[PDB]
Write a protein that binds this DNA or RNA. Sequence first.
RNA 1: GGGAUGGCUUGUGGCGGCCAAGCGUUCAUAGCGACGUCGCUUUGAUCCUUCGAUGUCGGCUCUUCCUAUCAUACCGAAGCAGAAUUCGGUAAGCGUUGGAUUGUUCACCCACUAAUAGGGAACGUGAGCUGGGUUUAGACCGUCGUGAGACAGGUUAGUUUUACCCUACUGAUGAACUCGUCGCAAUGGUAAUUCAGCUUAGUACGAGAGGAACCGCUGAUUCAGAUAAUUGGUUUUU
RNA 2: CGCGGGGUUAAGGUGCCGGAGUGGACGCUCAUCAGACACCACAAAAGGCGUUAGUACAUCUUGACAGCAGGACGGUGGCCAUGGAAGUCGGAAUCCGCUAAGGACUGUGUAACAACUCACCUGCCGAAUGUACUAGCCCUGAAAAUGGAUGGCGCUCAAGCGU
Lengths: 79, 237, 97, 169, 135, 254, 190, 67
Amino acid sequence: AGTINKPKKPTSKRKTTRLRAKISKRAAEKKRKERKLARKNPEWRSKLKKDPGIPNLFPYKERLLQQIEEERIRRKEEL
Amino acid sequence: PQNEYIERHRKLHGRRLDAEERARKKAAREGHKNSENAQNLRGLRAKLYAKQRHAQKIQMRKAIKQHEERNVPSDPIPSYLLDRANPTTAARFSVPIPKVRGISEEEMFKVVKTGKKTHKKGWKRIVTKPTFVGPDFTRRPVKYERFIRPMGLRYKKANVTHPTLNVTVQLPILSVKKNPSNPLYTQLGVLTKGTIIEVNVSDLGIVTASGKIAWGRYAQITNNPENDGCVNAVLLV
Amino acid sequence: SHRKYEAPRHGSLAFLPRKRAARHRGRVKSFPKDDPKKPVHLTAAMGYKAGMTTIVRDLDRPGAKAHKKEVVEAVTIIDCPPMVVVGLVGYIETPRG
Amino acid sequence: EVPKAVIEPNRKWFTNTRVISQDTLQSFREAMAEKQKDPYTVLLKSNKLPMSLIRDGPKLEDGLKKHQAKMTIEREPFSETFGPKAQRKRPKLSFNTVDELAGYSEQSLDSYHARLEEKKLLSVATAKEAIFNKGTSKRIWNELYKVIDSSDVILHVLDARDPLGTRCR
Amino acid sequence: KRGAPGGKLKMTLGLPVGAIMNCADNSGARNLYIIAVKGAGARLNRLPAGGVGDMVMATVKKGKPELRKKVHPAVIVRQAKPWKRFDGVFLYFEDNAGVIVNPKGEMKGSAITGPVGKEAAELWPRIASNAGVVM
Amino acid sequence: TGWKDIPPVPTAQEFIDIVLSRTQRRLPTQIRPGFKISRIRAFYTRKVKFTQETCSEKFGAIISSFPVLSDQHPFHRDLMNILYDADHFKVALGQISTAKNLIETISRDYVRLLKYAQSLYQCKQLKRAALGRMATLIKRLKDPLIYLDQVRQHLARLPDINPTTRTLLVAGFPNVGKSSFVRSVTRADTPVEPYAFTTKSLFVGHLDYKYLRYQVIDTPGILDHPLEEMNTIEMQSVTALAHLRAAVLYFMDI
Amino acid sequence: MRYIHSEETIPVPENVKVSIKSRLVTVEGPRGKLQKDLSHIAVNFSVVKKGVIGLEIHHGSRKDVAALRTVRTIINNMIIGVTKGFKYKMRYVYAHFPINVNVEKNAETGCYEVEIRNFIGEKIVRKVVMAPGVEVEISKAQKDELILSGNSLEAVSQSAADIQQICKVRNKDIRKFLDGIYVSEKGNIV
Amino acid sequence: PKSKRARVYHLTQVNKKGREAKERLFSNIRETIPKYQHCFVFSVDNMRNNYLKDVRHELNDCRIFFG
RNA sequence: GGGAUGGCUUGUGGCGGCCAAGCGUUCAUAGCGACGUCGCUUUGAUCCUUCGAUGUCGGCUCUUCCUAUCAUACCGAAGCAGAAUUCGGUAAGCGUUGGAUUGUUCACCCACUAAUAGGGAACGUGAGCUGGGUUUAGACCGUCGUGAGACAGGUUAGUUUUACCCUACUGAUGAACUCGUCGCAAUGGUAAUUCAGCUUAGUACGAGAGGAACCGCUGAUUCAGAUAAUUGGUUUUU
RNA sequence: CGCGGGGUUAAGGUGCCGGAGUGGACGCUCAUCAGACACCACAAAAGGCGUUAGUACAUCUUGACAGCAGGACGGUGGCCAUGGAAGUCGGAAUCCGCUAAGGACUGUGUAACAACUCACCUGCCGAAUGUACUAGCCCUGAAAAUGGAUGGCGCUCAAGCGU
Ligand SMILES: [Mg+2]
């Protein structure tokens, strides 16, 4: 496009008070509406969230798995 | 020239000497050109471009998945019904739409002004929604016509869906049974959302248990006809 | 709302303002670009407009309809007595002109 | 004021409002077959009837010609008839033998010459004057349909010097 | 090819749209009512006008009934508004008159009554061949 | 003359894109809810009417440019039937005309509704309904448009044959020298090859004899079986021999 | 990520003299001298070995590391230009109007000039002024062939591109009209 | 790296072999070892080697590995 | 006595069913779901189905802006042979016209033309001139009313009448620096446009019918700036 | 929140207008009208061969990814169809041998063959790569109509963004 040689009318970043107040009111109303929809949401949710686990690039992941295994063995032996 | 003369000219003389190299270089530059189009187009052209690229990406993913899975009717019907286009076919006596937006009288009717003075009489009301006037309709004389149901807003047919058969047929409207906003709207025959209408169901071929032919049933209007230009209804079965 | 039938604007904005000239004698705003390879020559002269008259020209314009025919044309006579050279002005170039 | 627009649950929504028996249908079909036109009788109130089950069907020529186009396209799709992937090899001919072809060409030439002669028997011209469009305006016909919608009796007035000329079919 | 001829020097246009000129041929028409001029430009409110040697579109107001229903191309051969030639002569004819032609410039009639102008004769060879006097 | 002056036939999606881009770009697009309701009605009514007018112009240009089979000489009518199935030709053009009529009906209905619409939202919904119904009608025409574009290109490349002039019709079996003779006596570029059915279409050349223009028609070869077993390639030659008043030159290779 | 040290190498032939001062590279060979200013690219030049030029970037981004490859190819192309040279062979073909090519050398400017006449019967005379250092000759071994040679690959190839672009068919079907002048071969003079 | 060469997914029948081909070659060579008296090593350097099919057909009693 | 929806909008219908990458769920296998798809909405026809003003538009005269480009310039693609085009891109520099029709939503017809593109600056109330919505008082006709009168309505005739103020704009003088002559040029403005004919050439291209272009040359359209030798007009040269 | 003097702060600020830092540390970002008072809409599970940081899966000296040099075969011109149709106009099947590997074939091509090419394999080379998502910042994600606005100048290892 010929933007450099013949620029067009600029897009103003100077906000107006009316638009700022309208956007704040709409954001607050959207927050309240989203809270109401979350209250009335029928979508299933798990009791316990899925855990990401231990990252593979952690260099002592195998030692951490060993420590978990010995801890669960000790817990099963004590219980 | 006649018949396939450009193909014959190709056969006798070939193409321009750089045609293959230019085509290969353009196909090579295609990736940079597509990224430039994605980052530099503006407005509606950019929106249509983004929609169309979304479509190509979805289709390419489907083709790749099908090629990955290359190495791996529903209802019983008689033999004479095989290979035909058959429909998919998917107490509390509640209708599918028990509650709709209520229409105020101010929204329903507009004041028609009469008289030659600057101050005008205002007793005439025009119905702004589609209506059904029934058979053998003759309009009231203009001196005694309070409610104006204009000719261009009058309907006679509706696209009616049978939920069990999964079949939509255009059927004639027999009457208007209940407009949920107002009994006056029922009397005027207003066709809005949630309105119960009587429909001629002779096309659907419904036979009762005693062998009689049912040709009148109830359907509920499921759309906004004043916005859509048509009446959509679902049979109450 | 928009103008219903298009029409070009009356007069040119290149010749604004339409005021009286600041001087009676015409001002040479620009002289021909100098070339040192050319021999020396004067670039302008003065005269006095005397009036107009009519001529007949034997036209030699290949391609024209009036080629090899006589054409009547209006001309302007400018009385030109010789000038007298009385001075010499030198001009340098500065970043202000 | 915005009312509450609610439909109550009711068993009447799920029943048949209008039913008819086969004997009544047969009687109405016989009446439909035997009915005649009388200029000195007027219709005052139509009987609400399932007229699709009572009216006689269309003619078989009309019924076949109404579906011939979709039948031809279902038999041979457009992509199989002409195009880069077309598989059509044998044309559909109205003749079977060479003698039939010679006769068909003779009558085709005769009919073509007859059509050309009737077309011939039947500087650009000036535009038709807008005065001759009078009586066809949207405002006038809006008035006419308003009057027709308002009236019970319609007096169609004819000039006795040209009745069929001034008749509005 | 639109009917405006090329190689025509500027002259005074004496016949605007709405002028009734004489018919100088034997095509059966007696006058020509000008409704358009070939090659006319676009200017607000300006009537399109033509001069000798210009092609116009004309309707017949008086003559044979077979010519009254059509819009004919015509060439203006005589005008009464004085105009100047390149030799300096200002000249004018005693009437305004044209001849009916086709878009290719060939004449509808077979004879021309009275003289034709040099501009019309030089731009249209059929009019030159059918002209008795060229002035 | 020929049929090279038929405008190109777009596909259904290209047709929809062309029409909607004309409506978007050749008309104003900005309307405000605070304006007068008559102003809003006029805006949306103009949108609907302009869309229909563009569709009507394109469909009428398609219909009026294609040949009318009933108005042709019997040679051209039969040759058109041999090249493209005449039932398919008429069905495609009838679908085009029916779609044009239905689009005009939709436009009239929605203009009538926009006369009574009461708000900018209702006017916008009615305009979108009208335009979407036109788009659905055009989307139903996907296969006839492709067929008509192919037929248009073939018609544009068809040779010009005058059925009422002096013509020499060269016919016979394949590989007997028909194209060689037509090349030797005319300027037509008809290929000559040793394999059968090298010539798959009618070719026409011209010559001058005693200051008279003669046209010479080279044909595909004809085999020895009844008419029901001939393909379209041989049926072109049979059509020319049946309907062209010509001098027949039957070539034999003894 | 910033890479601490990145390095490229350029071998130099035994008959080539390379002098670099403030990122201005001068390459001298049997065929002549070429110069190129590379001051727009941050690079440390060095002599890592005899007959080897080292190029390095310290603490650069991936783009800065990648730019050394372009610098390496530019200097290698200059070395190849002063040793073997560059040659582009072009062919001009036509259907009916024979294209006439006249090659002269302007004594005032030292540059070659190519005049193209009768390109599809056009009456205009096309004139292309060649880049300095580019020699143009009409071939005698083949038919309708021009040979462009030089030390600067960019100059030779841009001159060939100018010749190719000046003979462009406009408002015609390019499937049918095949006239033009096209680069047919690229290689070294030696 | 957003800027990358687009990898072409081949919509063809034959896929890449992998480690299964290597294990199959191992098993085939190790099982053909005990069945023969001699094992020759041959070289074909800078040759088209499409005539090894004819060599295999002629030496039908032998086994040839070109892996 | 008070009073006079708006970071809106634009290009792709609604209803019902199905599929569905995915989201969720994996003590319940439900519920959302883009992309799509399926059903309701004449063999090139018929011309014997035009479906309601409460909402009002106009025209001159003149300037400027937007681009959402009709034409002109350049470019990409198409059986684009040539010619004529079609779709698309950059582009608002430059143009975009007479005319007919008031039994009427004045919108459409005809022609010329390169083309007869669309909008804003009013219509998100609103003193330039002047016609329709349109409407004080006179008057008939129709409808309603016992009537005064009102209106479903139709017709006719009918009073607003600045500028010398300030600013803006267009031009014209000017104090201070002695008067004057010759100059510079910051900044502001800025201008040209389109068609045709000759040659190329009946050439390239083409089966034929037909049929270009670059360089070169000559006119004309619209615009602009001057001028009065000539020709017309004007006459208190009384 | 009475009239004054001194001291200290809050919200907000410290490149200049403007009193106070071109203050310090680590990064990110280059926008053809960036961004700097954003959350709302446009707007989608949206489009980017822009740029980083990650997550998962996978290949790799038994040689991965990219290339170059070569192979890409035999039953077989598989069946039906077609004027012709040999992997490559179509309909349907889609197996075996030789294998290192090679589809009853991915495209170009022929009237049909031929010829070329891809999938796949070997040799040369030589060390890290590939795919898909996630999170930052950047571009696009629709705009009218007098000439104008992060308040203005302007600012690019900031005078932008996060701590
Ligand atoms: Mg042969």
